[PDB]
Design a protein around this ligand. Structure first.
Ligand code: MG
Ligand code: MG
Ligand code: MG
Ligand code: MG
Ligand code: MG
Ligand code: MG
Ligand code: MG
Ligand code: MG
Ligand code: MG
Ligand code: MG
Ligand code: MG
Ligand code: MG
Ligand code: MG
Ligand code: MG
Ligand code: MG
Ligand code: MG
Ligand code: MG
Ligand code: MG
Ligand code: MG
Ligand code: MG
Ligand code: MG
Ligand code: MG
Lengths: 88, 71, 138, 101
RNA sequence: CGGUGAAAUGCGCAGAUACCGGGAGGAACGCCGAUGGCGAAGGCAGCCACCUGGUCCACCCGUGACGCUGAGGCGCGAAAGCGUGGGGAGCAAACCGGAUUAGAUACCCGGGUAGUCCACGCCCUAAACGAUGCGCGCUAGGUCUCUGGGUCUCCUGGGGGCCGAAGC
Protein backbone atom coordinates (compact mmCIF):
# COMPACT_ATOMS: atom_id res chain seq x y z
CA UNK A 1 0.00 0.00 0.00
CA UNK A 2 1.07 3.50 0.95
CA UNK A 3 1.87 3.84 4.64
CA UNK A 4 0.76 6.96 6.50
CA UNK A 5 4.38 7.93 6.90
CA UNK A 6 4.99 7.68 3.12
CA UNK A 7 1.97 9.69 2.06
CA UNK A 8 2.46 12.32 4.70
CA UNK A 9 5.89 13.14 3.21
CA UNK A 10 4.15 13.78 -0.12
CA UNK A 11 1.70 16.10 1.53
CA UNK A 12 4.47 18.10 3.19
CA UNK A 13 6.33 18.19 -0.08
CA UNK A 14 3.56 19.89 -2.02
CA UNK A 15 1.80 21.72 0.83
CA UNK A 16 1.18 25.33 -0.27
CA UNK A 17 1.90 26.51 3.29
CA UNK A 18 2.57 24.84 6.66
CA UNK A 19 -0.46 22.66 7.52
CA UNK A 20 -2.29 22.65 4.17
CA UNK A 21 -3.77 19.15 4.46
CA UNK A 22 -5.35 19.42 0.98
CA UNK A 23 -5.14 22.28 -1.58
CA UNK A 24 -5.25 21.63 -5.31
CA UNK A 25 -1.54 20.81 -5.66
CA UNK A 26 -1.71 18.44 -2.74
CA UNK A 27 -4.75 16.61 -4.15
CA UNK A 28 -3.06 16.23 -7.48
CA UNK A 29 0.08 15.00 -5.68
CA UNK A 30 -1.54 12.36 -3.46
CA UNK A 31 -3.57 11.31 -6.46
CA UNK A 32 -0.50 11.15 -8.74
CA UNK A 33 1.02 8.84 -6.17
CA UNK A 34 -1.90 6.42 -5.95
CA UNK A 35 -1.86 6.22 -9.75
CA UNK A 36 1.76 5.34 -10.41
CA UNK A 37 1.49 2.97 -7.42
CA UNK A 38 -1.60 1.30 -9.00
CA UNK A 39 -0.36 1.49 -12.56
CA UNK A 40 2.73 -0.46 -11.50
CA UNK A 41 0.54 -3.11 -9.96
CA UNK A 42 -1.20 -3.28 -13.35
CA UNK A 43 1.93 -4.04 -15.33
CA UNK A 44 2.20 -7.25 -13.32
CA UNK A 45 -1.49 -8.00 -12.98
CA UNK A 46 -2.89 -7.41 -16.45
CA UNK A 47 -5.94 -9.40 -15.47
CA UNK A 48 -7.04 -7.16 -12.61
CA UNK A 49 -9.53 -5.50 -14.97
CA UNK A 50 -11.62 -4.38 -12.06
CA UNK A 51 -8.86 -2.33 -10.47
CA UNK A 52 -8.11 -0.70 -13.80
CA UNK A 53 -11.61 0.76 -13.53
CA UNK A 54 -10.58 2.72 -10.47
CA UNK A 55 -7.50 3.84 -12.35
CA UNK A 56 -9.49 5.59 -15.03
CA UNK A 57 -11.48 7.23 -12.29
CA UNK A 58 -8.31 8.35 -10.48
CA UNK A 59 -6.77 9.54 -13.73
CA UNK A 60 -9.83 11.40 -14.93
CA UNK A 61 -10.12 13.07 -11.57
CA UNK A 62 -6.48 14.14 -11.72
CA UNK A 63 -7.18 15.74 -15.10
CA UNK A 64 -10.16 17.74 -13.86
CA UNK A 65 -8.20 19.18 -10.99
CA UNK A 66 -5.35 20.14 -13.27
CA UNK A 67 -7.90 21.45 -15.83
CA UNK A 68 -9.16 23.72 -13.03
CA UNK A 69 -5.73 24.84 -12.05
CA UNK A 70 -4.76 25.62 -15.65
CA UNK A 71 -7.70 28.06 -15.81
CA UNK A 72 -7.14 29.31 -12.25
CA UNK A 73 -3.42 30.05 -11.97
CA UNK A 74 -1.57 28.96 -15.12
CA UNK A 75 1.78 29.40 -13.36
CA UNK A 76 1.02 27.06 -10.46
CA UNK A 77 -0.01 24.66 -13.24
CA UNK A 78 3.43 24.68 -14.91
CA UNK A 79 5.04 24.32 -11.51
CA UNK A 80 2.88 21.43 -10.37
CA UNK A 81 3.18 19.51 -13.67
CA UNK A 82 6.97 19.85 -14.00
CA UNK A 83 7.42 19.14 -10.30
CA UNK A 84 5.75 15.71 -10.97
CA UNK A 85 6.41 15.16 -14.69
CA UNK A 86 2.94 14.79 -16.22
CA UNK A 87 1.07 15.36 -19.50
CA UNK A 88 2.61 12.84 -21.94
CA UNK B 1 -35.34 -22.42 22.45
CA UNK B 2 -33.74 -25.86 22.98
CA UNK B 3 -30.42 -24.48 24.35
CA UNK B 4 -28.42 -21.40 23.20
CA UNK B 5 -24.57 -21.84 23.18
CA UNK B 6 -24.06 -18.08 23.70
CA UNK B 7 -25.42 -18.41 27.28
CA UNK B 8 -23.81 -21.72 28.43
CA UNK B 9 -20.43 -20.01 27.97
CA UNK B 10 -18.57 -17.11 29.58
CA UNK B 11 -16.71 -14.69 27.36
CA UNK B 12 -14.30 -15.98 24.74
CA UNK B 13 -12.34 -14.94 21.66
CA UNK B 14 -14.19 -15.75 18.42
CA UNK B 15 -11.02 -15.19 16.42
CA UNK B 16 -9.24 -17.82 18.56
CA UNK B 17 -8.93 -20.74 16.21
CA UNK B 18 -7.10 -22.91 18.73
CA UNK B 19 -9.60 -22.96 21.60
CA UNK B 20 -10.97 -26.39 20.78
CA UNK B 21 -12.87 -26.78 24.07
CA UNK B 22 -14.97 -23.78 23.10
CA UNK B 23 -15.21 -24.36 19.36
CA UNK B 24 -16.20 -28.00 19.77
CA UNK B 25 -19.53 -26.72 21.12
CA UNK B 26 -20.54 -24.94 17.90
CA UNK B 27 -20.64 -28.17 15.82
CA UNK B 28 -23.25 -30.93 15.57
CA UNK B 29 -23.14 -34.72 16.07
CA UNK B 30 -21.62 -34.40 12.65
CA UNK B 31 -18.79 -31.95 12.11
CA UNK B 32 -21.37 -29.52 10.82
CA UNK B 33 -21.12 -25.85 11.87
CA UNK B 34 -24.32 -25.19 13.78
CA UNK B 35 -26.97 -22.83 12.39
CA UNK B 36 -27.13 -19.37 13.88
CA UNK B 37 -30.51 -20.50 15.25
CA UNK B 38 -28.83 -22.91 17.69
CA UNK B 39 -25.67 -20.83 18.22
CA UNK B 40 -27.55 -17.70 19.32
CA UNK B 41 -24.63 -15.78 17.77
CA UNK B 42 -24.89 -12.29 16.29
CA UNK B 43 -24.99 -11.73 12.57
CA UNK B 44 -21.37 -10.49 12.69
CA UNK B 45 -20.35 -13.03 15.27
CA UNK B 46 -21.50 -15.99 13.21
CA UNK B 47 -19.40 -14.97 10.23
CA UNK B 48 -16.34 -14.66 12.40
CA UNK B 49 -16.91 -17.95 14.18
CA UNK B 50 -17.47 -19.47 10.77
CA UNK B 51 -14.01 -18.56 9.63
CA UNK B 52 -12.34 -19.49 12.90
CA UNK B 53 -13.77 -23.04 12.83
CA UNK B 54 -12.66 -23.44 9.19
CA UNK B 55 -9.13 -22.30 10.21
CA UNK B 56 -9.11 -24.76 13.14
CA UNK B 57 -10.36 -27.75 11.13
CA UNK B 58 -7.57 -27.16 8.64
CA UNK B 59 -5.26 -27.20 11.61
CA UNK B 60 -6.44 -30.72 12.55
CA UNK B 61 -8.14 -29.73 15.83
CA UNK B 62 -11.82 -29.74 14.79
CA UNK B 63 -13.44 -32.30 12.49
CA UNK B 64 -14.62 -31.60 8.97
CA UNK B 65 -17.27 -34.27 9.32
CA UNK B 66 -18.32 -36.94 11.76
CA UNK B 67 -20.55 -39.97 11.52
CA UNK B 68 -23.96 -40.07 13.16
CA UNK B 69 -24.19 -42.61 16.00
CA UNK B 70 -27.73 -43.70 16.64
CA UNK B 71 -27.86 -42.98 20.34
CA UNK C 1 -26.55 18.48 -9.14
CA UNK C 2 -28.71 21.53 -8.54
CA UNK C 3 -29.19 23.43 -11.80
CA UNK C 4 -32.24 25.53 -11.36
CA UNK C 5 -32.66 26.97 -7.84
CA UNK C 6 -35.76 28.94 -8.81
CA UNK C 7 -37.42 25.76 -10.05
CA UNK C 8 -36.26 24.29 -6.78
CA UNK C 9 -37.85 27.14 -4.89
CA UNK C 10 -41.18 26.95 -6.68
CA UNK C 11 -41.28 23.21 -6.46
CA UNK C 12 -40.45 23.41 -2.78
CA UNK C 13 -43.55 25.51 -2.30
CA UNK C 14 -45.68 23.33 -4.55
CA UNK C 15 -44.90 20.06 -2.75
CA UNK C 16 -45.24 21.80 0.61
CA UNK C 17 -48.69 23.09 0.09
CA UNK C 18 -50.03 19.72 -1.17
CA UNK C 19 -49.34 18.37 2.33
CA UNK C 20 -50.69 21.51 3.89
CA UNK C 21 -47.38 22.30 5.55
CA UNK C 22 -47.73 25.50 7.57
CA UNK C 23 -44.36 26.70 6.24
CA UNK C 24 -41.18 25.64 4.43
CA UNK C 25 -37.61 26.79 4.38
CA UNK C 26 -35.78 27.48 1.15
CA UNK C 27 -32.08 28.25 0.76
CA UNK C 28 -31.83 32.01 0.32
CA UNK C 29 -30.87 34.21 -2.63
CA UNK C 30 -31.44 37.92 -3.33
CA UNK C 31 -33.41 36.82 -6.39
CA UNK C 32 -35.63 34.18 -4.85
CA UNK C 33 -36.47 36.61 -2.06
CA UNK C 34 -37.66 39.02 -4.72
CA UNK C 35 -39.96 36.47 -6.27
CA UNK C 36 -41.22 35.74 -2.76
CA UNK C 37 -41.71 39.43 -2.11
CA UNK C 38 -44.02 39.43 -5.13
CA UNK C 39 -45.90 36.29 -4.11
CA UNK C 40 -46.47 37.95 -0.77
CA UNK C 41 -48.07 41.12 -2.13
CA UNK C 42 -50.38 39.17 -4.39
CA UNK C 43 -51.54 37.07 -1.43
CA UNK C 44 -50.39 33.55 -2.46
CA UNK C 45 -48.33 33.29 0.74
CA UNK C 46 -48.75 34.92 4.15
CA UNK C 47 -45.19 36.14 3.76
CA UNK C 48 -41.61 34.98 4.08
CA UNK C 49 -39.13 35.67 6.86
CA UNK C 50 -35.36 35.32 6.61
CA UNK C 51 -33.97 32.67 9.00
CA UNK C 52 -30.83 30.68 9.67
CA UNK C 53 -30.41 26.92 9.43
CA UNK C 54 -27.03 25.85 10.88
CA UNK C 55 -25.67 29.29 10.12
CA UNK C 56 -26.89 28.92 6.57
CA UNK C 57 -29.07 31.69 5.01
CA UNK C 58 -32.61 30.45 4.38
CA UNK C 59 -36.06 31.82 3.67
CA UNK C 60 -39.03 30.56 5.60
CA UNK C 61 -42.01 30.63 3.26
CA UNK C 62 -45.28 30.69 5.23
CA UNK C 63 -48.05 29.13 3.07
CA UNK C 64 -51.71 30.16 2.93
CA UNK C 65 -54.73 28.00 2.42
CA UNK C 66 -58.48 27.95 1.85
CA UNK C 67 -60.92 27.32 4.70
CA UNK C 68 -61.74 23.81 5.82
CA UNK C 69 -64.46 22.19 3.76
CA UNK C 70 -67.41 19.91 4.50
CA UNK C 71 -67.96 16.72 2.53
CA UNK C 72 -65.89 13.69 2.88
CA UNK C 73 -62.51 15.29 2.09
CA UNK C 74 -62.00 18.55 3.99
CA UNK C 75 -58.54 19.56 2.81
CA UNK C 76 -58.85 23.35 2.12
CA UNK C 77 -58.87 24.94 -1.33
CA UNK C 78 -55.31 25.70 -2.35
CA UNK C 79 -54.41 29.38 -2.66
CA UNK C 80 -51.50 28.58 -4.92
CA UNK C 81 -53.44 26.19 -7.10
CA UNK C 82 -50.73 25.96 -9.73
CA UNK C 83 -47.20 27.26 -9.75
CA UNK C 84 -44.96 26.66 -12.77
CA UNK C 85 -41.53 27.59 -14.08
CA UNK C 86 -41.40 28.93 -17.59
CA UNK C 87 -37.95 30.13 -18.57
CA UNK C 88 -35.61 27.35 -17.62
CA UNK C 89 -31.86 26.89 -18.09
CA UNK C 90 -31.36 25.16 -21.42
CA UNK C 91 -34.32 27.03 -22.83
CA UNK C 92 -34.61 30.67 -21.82
CA UNK C 93 -37.75 32.58 -22.54
CA UNK C 94 -37.57 36.28 -23.23
CA UNK C 95 -40.73 38.27 -23.90
CA UNK C 96 -41.16 41.67 -25.50
CA UNK C 97 -43.80 43.85 -23.88
CA UNK C 98 -46.49 43.29 -26.45
CA UNK C 99 -45.93 39.56 -25.85
CA UNK C 100 -46.16 39.41 -22.06
CA UNK C 101 -49.05 37.08 -21.50
CA UNK C 102 -52.22 37.03 -19.44
CA UNK C 103 -52.52 34.31 -16.82
CA UNK C 104 -56.04 32.92 -16.32
CA UNK C 105 -58.03 35.77 -17.78
CA UNK C 106 -56.34 38.16 -15.36
CA UNK C 107 -56.80 35.91 -12.35
CA UNK C 108 -53.26 34.69 -12.18
CA UNK C 109 -49.76 36.07 -12.23
CA UNK C 110 -46.81 35.87 -14.55
CA UNK C 111 -43.59 36.84 -12.80
CA UNK C 112 -41.13 38.65 -14.97
CA UNK C 113 -37.48 39.51 -14.61
CA UNK C 114 -36.75 42.87 -16.24
CA UNK C 115 -34.05 45.49 -16.28
CA UNK C 116 -36.45 47.45 -14.11
CA UNK C 117 -37.01 44.71 -11.55
CA UNK C 118 -38.89 41.57 -10.73
CA UNK C 119 -42.37 42.55 -11.89
CA UNK C 120 -45.81 40.99 -12.23
CA UNK C 121 -47.25 40.89 -15.74
CA UNK C 122 -49.35 43.92 -14.86
CA UNK C 123 -46.55 45.79 -13.08
CA UNK C 124 -44.31 45.27 -16.09
CA UNK C 125 -46.87 46.14 -18.73
CA UNK C 126 -47.44 49.34 -16.82
CA UNK C 127 -43.77 50.31 -16.84
CA UNK C 128 -43.79 49.46 -20.52
CA UNK C 129 -40.99 46.88 -20.38
CA UNK C 130 -40.48 43.14 -20.76
CA UNK C 131 -37.85 40.56 -19.93
CA UNK C 132 -37.36 36.99 -18.78
CA UNK C 133 -40.57 35.11 -18.21
CA UNK C 134 -39.82 33.28 -14.98
CA UNK C 135 -42.96 31.48 -13.84
CA UNK C 136 -46.79 31.57 -13.86
CA UNK C 137 -49.12 31.33 -10.79
CA UNK C 138 -52.80 30.98 -9.86
CA UNK D 1 6.32 -4.43 8.53
CA UNK D 2 3.58 -6.85 9.71
CA UNK D 3 3.11 -9.32 12.57
CA UNK D 4 1.80 -12.85 12.18
CA UNK D 5 1.23 -16.24 13.82
CA UNK D 6 3.21 -19.22 12.57
CA UNK D 7 1.57 -22.58 13.16
CA UNK D 8 3.40 -25.83 12.61
CA UNK D 9 2.33 -29.40 13.06
CA UNK D 10 4.93 -32.15 13.30
CA UNK D 11 4.51 -35.86 13.75
CA UNK D 12 4.35 -36.98 17.41
CA UNK D 13 7.03 -39.72 17.33
CA UNK D 14 10.19 -37.66 17.18
CA UNK D 15 12.59 -38.62 19.96
CA UNK D 16 13.89 -35.64 21.92
CA UNK D 17 17.15 -35.30 19.96
CA UNK D 18 15.25 -35.33 16.65
CA UNK D 19 12.41 -32.98 17.68
CA UNK D 20 15.04 -30.59 19.00
CA UNK D 21 16.55 -30.36 15.51
CA UNK D 22 13.32 -29.45 13.73
CA UNK D 23 12.81 -26.68 16.34
CA UNK D 24 16.20 -25.24 15.39
CA UNK D 25 15.81 -25.60 11.61
CA UNK D 26 12.48 -23.82 12.01
CA UNK D 27 14.18 -21.18 14.09
CA UNK D 28 16.85 -20.77 11.40
CA UNK D 29 14.35 -20.32 8.59
CA UNK D 30 12.65 -17.74 10.81
CA UNK D 31 16.05 -16.19 11.53
CA UNK D 32 16.68 -16.23 7.77
CA UNK D 33 13.52 -14.58 6.48
CA UNK D 34 13.67 -11.46 8.66
CA UNK D 35 11.15 -13.03 11.03
CA UNK D 36 11.85 -11.56 14.47
CA UNK D 37 10.13 -13.78 17.09
CA UNK D 38 8.02 -12.05 19.76
CA UNK D 39 6.82 -15.08 21.69
CA UNK D 40 6.27 -18.83 21.56
CA UNK D 41 3.80 -21.43 22.85
CA UNK D 42 4.69 -25.10 22.52
CA UNK D 43 1.34 -26.76 23.22
CA UNK D 44 3.02 -30.08 22.66
CA UNK D 45 0.66 -32.65 21.23
CA UNK D 46 -3.10 -32.91 21.00
CA UNK D 47 -5.17 -35.70 19.51
CA UNK D 48 -6.42 -34.61 16.08
CA UNK D 49 -9.91 -34.83 14.69
CA UNK D 50 -8.68 -36.74 11.67
CA UNK D 51 -5.59 -38.70 10.61
CA UNK D 52 -3.11 -36.13 9.38
CA UNK D 53 -0.42 -38.17 7.57
CA UNK D 54 -2.00 -41.43 8.82
CA UNK D 55 -1.23 -40.87 12.54
CA UNK D 56 -3.97 -39.75 15.01
CA UNK D 57 -1.89 -37.21 16.96
CA UNK D 58 0.14 -34.17 16.02
CA UNK D 59 2.85 -32.05 17.63
CA UNK D 60 2.05 -28.35 17.79
CA UNK D 61 4.17 -25.23 17.52
CA UNK D 62 3.06 -21.57 17.66
CA UNK D 63 5.06 -18.41 17.03
CA UNK D 64 3.91 -14.81 17.23
CA UNK D 65 6.59 -13.47 14.86
CA UNK D 66 7.31 -10.20 13.05
CA UNK D 67 8.27 -10.79 9.42
CA UNK D 68 8.55 -8.22 6.74
CA UNK D 69 5.30 -8.58 4.72
CA UNK D 70 6.36 -9.64 1.22
CA UNK D 71 8.47 -12.62 2.37
CA UNK D 72 5.83 -14.49 4.37
CA UNK D 73 4.98 -16.65 1.46
CA UNK D 74 8.54 -17.80 0.99
CA UNK D 75 8.95 -18.62 4.66
CA UNK D 76 5.97 -20.91 4.56
CA UNK D 77 6.87 -23.12 1.60
CA UNK D 78 10.37 -23.05 3.05
CA UNK D 79 9.09 -24.28 6.40
CA UNK D 80 6.94 -26.80 4.55
CA UNK D 81 9.81 -28.62 2.74
CA UNK D 82 10.99 -30.35 5.90
CA UNK D 83 9.44 -33.87 5.66
CA UNK D 84 8.55 -34.17 9.35
CA UNK D 85 6.34 -31.08 9.05
CA UNK D 86 2.80 -32.19 8.34
CA UNK D 87 1.28 -28.72 8.23
CA UNK D 88 2.34 -25.09 8.32
CA UNK D 89 -0.15 -22.21 8.52
CA UNK D 90 1.02 -18.60 8.95
CA UNK D 91 -1.73 -16.14 9.75
CA UNK D 92 -1.98 -12.35 10.34
CA UNK D 93 -2.38 -11.33 13.93
CA UNK D 94 -5.69 -9.71 14.88
CA UNK D 95 -7.40 -8.29 18.01
CA UNK D 96 -9.75 -10.76 19.77
CA UNK D 97 -13.49 -10.56 19.20
CA UNK D 98 -15.22 -11.21 22.56
CA UNK D 99 -18.69 -12.72 22.94
CA UNK D 100 -21.03 -13.81 25.78
CA UNK D 101 -24.70 -13.96 26.99
C1' C E 1 -24.59 -55.70 -9.76
C1' G E 2 -26.85 -51.72 -12.10
C1' G E 3 -31.03 -49.68 -14.03
C1' U E 4 -36.83 -48.09 -14.93
C1' G E 5 -43.54 -47.11 -14.48
C1' A E 6 -41.96 -52.17 -15.99
C1' A E 7 -37.57 -53.40 -18.62
C1' A E 8 -33.57 -54.32 -21.64
C1' U E 9 -28.82 -52.45 -23.52
C1' G E 10 -24.33 -52.52 -20.06
C1' C E 11 -21.06 -54.64 -16.48
C1' G E 12 -19.80 -59.76 -13.75
C1' C E 13 -16.61 -66.50 -12.61
C1' A E 14 -10.11 -62.62 -16.69
C1' G E 15 -14.19 -62.72 -9.70
C1' A E 16 -18.08 -57.45 -10.73
C1' U E 17 -21.26 -55.07 -6.76
C1' A E 18 -20.90 -54.51 -1.29
C1' C E 19 -16.32 -54.05 2.51
C1' C E 20 -11.03 -52.53 4.33
C1' G E 21 -6.24 -50.47 3.25
C1' G E 22 -2.62 -48.07 -0.44
C1' G E 23 -1.90 -44.75 -4.74
C1' A E 24 -2.84 -41.44 -8.83
C1' G E 25 -5.77 -37.79 -11.07
C1' G E 26 -9.24 -33.86 -12.19
C1' A E 27 -12.97 -30.71 -11.02
C1' A E 28 -16.06 -28.36 -7.74
C1' C E 29 -16.15 -26.40 -2.37
C1' G E 30 -21.10 -29.54 2.33
C1' C E 31 -22.34 -27.34 7.20
C1' C E 32 -21.79 -21.72 8.17
C1' G E 33 -25.55 -19.75 4.13
C1' A E 34 -29.88 -15.95 5.05
C1' U E 35 -35.72 -14.14 2.35
C1' G E 36 -27.54 -11.99 3.91
C1' G E 37 -22.83 -9.09 1.62
C1' C E 38 -19.79 -6.84 -2.37
C1' G E 39 -19.45 -5.02 -7.34
C1' A E 40 -20.72 -0.29 -12.96
C1' A E 41 -22.50 -4.21 -15.29
C1' G E 42 -21.40 -9.21 -16.83
C1' G E 43 -20.68 -11.47 -12.13
C1' C E 44 -18.31 -12.98 -7.03
C1' A E 45 -18.69 -17.94 -1.79
C1' G E 46 -13.14 -24.07 1.51
C1' C E 47 -8.51 -21.80 3.82
C1' C E 48 -3.91 -18.66 3.79
C1' A E 49 -0.51 -14.79 2.53
C1' C E 50 0.88 -11.13 -0.93
C1' C E 51 -0.60 -7.23 -4.60
C1' U E 52 -5.18 -4.05 -5.57
C1' G E 53 -10.31 -1.14 -6.72
C1' G E 54 -14.89 0.74 -4.78
C1' U E 55 -17.18 2.13 -0.31
C1' C E 56 -19.47 3.71 4.74
C1' C E 57 -19.08 6.44 9.61
C1' A E 58 -17.04 9.87 13.03
C1' C E 59 -13.87 14.72 13.41
C1' C E 60 -15.71 19.28 10.86
C1' C E 61 -9.09 20.12 9.78
C1' G E 62 -7.47 21.71 4.18
C1' U E 63 -8.78 23.42 -0.96
C1' G E 64 -12.75 27.21 -2.57
C1' A E 65 -17.74 25.81 -7.56
C1' C E 66 -12.79 22.78 -8.86
C1' G E 67 -19.63 20.61 -10.37
C1' C E 68 -23.43 17.36 -13.50
C1' U E 69 -24.17 14.89 -18.24
C1' G E 70 -21.98 12.96 -22.02
C1' A E 71 -22.35 12.05 -30.10
C1' G E 72 -18.09 9.65 -31.45
C1' G E 73 -13.70 7.37 -29.22
C1' C E 74 -11.49 3.84 -25.50
C1' G E 75 -11.96 -0.20 -21.90
C1' C E 76 -15.04 -4.15 -19.30
C1' G E 77 -18.68 -7.83 -21.10
C1' A E 78 -22.56 -14.73 -18.61
C1' A E 79 -22.97 -19.13 -21.86
C1' A E 80 -22.03 -21.18 -26.30
C1' G E 81 -18.41 -20.67 -30.06
C1' C E 82 -13.02 -19.89 -32.99
C1' G E 83 -7.02 -20.56 -33.16
C1' U E 84 -2.58 -22.64 -30.80
C1' G E 85 -0.75 -25.42 -26.53
C1' G E 86 -1.72 -28.18 -22.01
C1' G E 87 -5.46 -30.95 -19.30
C1' G E 88 -9.62 -34.55 -18.86
C1' A E 89 -12.32 -37.11 -12.77
C1' G E 90 -17.62 -36.19 -13.18
C1' C E 91 -20.83 -34.34 -16.75
C1' A E 92 -22.25 -34.25 -21.74
C1' A E 93 -24.39 -31.43 -27.97
C1' A E 94 -23.57 -34.72 -32.08
C1' C E 95 -23.12 -39.91 -32.68
C1' C E 96 -23.74 -45.50 -30.96
C1' G E 97 -27.07 -49.12 -28.50
C1' G E 98 -31.46 -50.38 -25.24
C1' A E 99 -36.60 -49.40 -24.38
C1' U E 100 -41.38 -46.66 -25.10
C1' U E 101 -44.87 -45.64 -28.91
C1' A E 102 -49.84 -46.02 -33.92
C1' G E 103 -44.74 -44.32 -35.50
C1' A E 104 -40.23 -41.79 -31.89
C1' U E 105 -36.75 -40.48 -35.68
C1' A E 106 -37.79 -37.14 -28.61
C1' C E 107 -39.18 -37.20 -23.30
C1' C E 108 -36.87 -42.68 -19.86
C1' C E 109 -32.04 -46.16 -19.53
C1' G E 110 -26.78 -47.82 -20.76
C1' G E 111 -22.36 -45.57 -23.60
C1' G E 112 -19.88 -41.54 -25.69
C1' U E 113 -16.64 -37.11 -29.06
C1' A E 114 -16.60 -31.86 -29.06
C1' G E 115 -17.11 -29.08 -24.91
C1' U E 116 -17.08 -28.10 -19.82
C1' C E 117 -11.01 -26.99 -16.86
C1' C E 118 -5.68 -23.70 -17.35
C1' A E 119 -2.77 -20.09 -20.34
C1' C E 120 -2.67 -16.83 -24.47
C1' G E 121 -5.31 -14.37 -28.44
C1' C E 122 -10.20 -13.86 -30.54
C1' C E 123 -15.59 -13.70 -30.54
C1' C E 124 -19.02 -9.04 -28.13
C1' U E 125 -24.15 -11.50 -28.30
C1' A E 126 -28.75 -12.42 -23.88
C1' A E 127 -35.44 -12.43 -20.79
C1' A E 128 -26.92 -8.63 -20.62
C1' C E 129 -34.02 -7.70 -16.34
C1' G E 130 -35.67 -3.68 -11.64
C1' A E 131 -37.62 -5.58 -18.88
C1' U E 132 -37.22 1.04 -14.80
C1' G E 133 -30.18 6.14 -17.85
C1' C E 134 -27.17 9.33 -14.77
C1' G E 135 -26.94 13.42 -11.20
C1' C E 136 -29.42 16.69 -7.58
C1' G E 137 -33.35 18.96 -4.49
C1' C E 138 -38.43 18.32 -2.43
C1' U E 139 -42.91 15.23 -0.56
C1' A E 140 -46.35 11.22 6.30
C1' G E 141 -45.23 7.00 8.66
C1' G E 142 -44.79 1.67 10.21
C1' U E 143 -42.01 -2.68 10.38
C1' C E 144 -37.78 -6.52 9.32
C1' U E 145 -32.82 -6.80 8.26
C1' C E 146 -26.94 -6.02 6.98
C1' U E 147 -23.49 -2.29 8.50
C1' G E 148 -21.09 2.45 11.00
C1' G E 149 -21.31 6.59 15.13
C1' G E 150 -23.76 8.91 20.04
C1' U E 151 -25.05 12.07 25.81
C1' C E 152 -25.80 4.08 22.62
C1' U E 153 -34.59 3.47 26.78
C1' C E 154 -33.70 5.62 22.19
C1' C E 155 -31.04 9.12 18.91
C1' U E 156 -28.24 9.69 14.11
C1' G E 157 -25.78 8.00 9.01
C1' G E 158 -25.30 4.37 4.75
C1' G E 159 -27.50 -0.32 2.38
C1' G E 160 -31.30 -4.24 1.73
C1' G E 161 -36.85 -5.87 2.01
C1' C E 162 -42.25 -5.74 3.19
C1' C E 163 -46.60 -2.45 4.20
C1' G E 164 -48.54 2.16 3.44
C1' A E 165 -49.82 9.33 3.55
C1' A E 166 -49.95 12.63 -0.33
C1' G E 167 -49.56 12.02 -5.15
C1' C E 168 -49.07 9.19 -9.87
MG1 MG F 1 -38.33 40.10 -30.15
MG1 MG G 1 -11.36 -47.66 -1.72
MG1 MG H 1 -5.67 -39.76 -15.67
MG1 MG I 1 -25.80 -3.62 -5.83
MG1 MG J 1 -27.58 -11.19 -12.00
MG1 MG K 1 -13.80 23.25 7.63
MG1 MG L 1 -9.93 31.57 -0.87
MG1 MG M 1 -10.42 30.32 2.71
MG1 MG N 1 -18.23 11.76 -13.17
MG1 MG O 1 -19.49 10.63 -17.54
MG1 MG P 1 -17.41 -13.13 -23.62
MG1 MG Q 1 -16.60 -20.24 -22.17
MG1 MG R 1 -10.98 -24.46 -27.31
MG1 MG S 1 -7.26 -28.78 -27.88
MG1 MG T 1 -32.01 -43.75 -30.63
MG1 MG U 1 -27.86 -40.17 -22.13
MG1 MG V 1 -22.54 -41.00 -18.74
MG1 MG W 1 -22.98 13.90 6.12
MG1 MG X 1 -28.99 1.79 12.57
MG1 MG Y 1 -33.60 2.69 4.37
MG1 MG Z 1 -45.80 -0.95 -1.84
MG1 MG a 1 -54.13 6.75 -2.08
Amino acid sequence: PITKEEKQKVIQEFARFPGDTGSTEVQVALLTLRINRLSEHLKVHKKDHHSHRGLLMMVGQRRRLLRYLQREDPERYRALIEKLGIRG
Amino acid sequence: RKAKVKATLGEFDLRDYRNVEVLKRFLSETGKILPRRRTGLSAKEQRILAKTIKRARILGLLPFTEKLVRK
Amino acid sequence: MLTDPIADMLTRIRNATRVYKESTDVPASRFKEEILRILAREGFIKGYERVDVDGKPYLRVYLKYGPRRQGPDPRPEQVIHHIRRISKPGRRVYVGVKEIPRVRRGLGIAILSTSKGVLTDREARKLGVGGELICEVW
Amino acid sequence: MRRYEVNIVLNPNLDQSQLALEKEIIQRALENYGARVEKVEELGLRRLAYPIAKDPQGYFLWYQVEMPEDRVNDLARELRIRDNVRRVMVVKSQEPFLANA
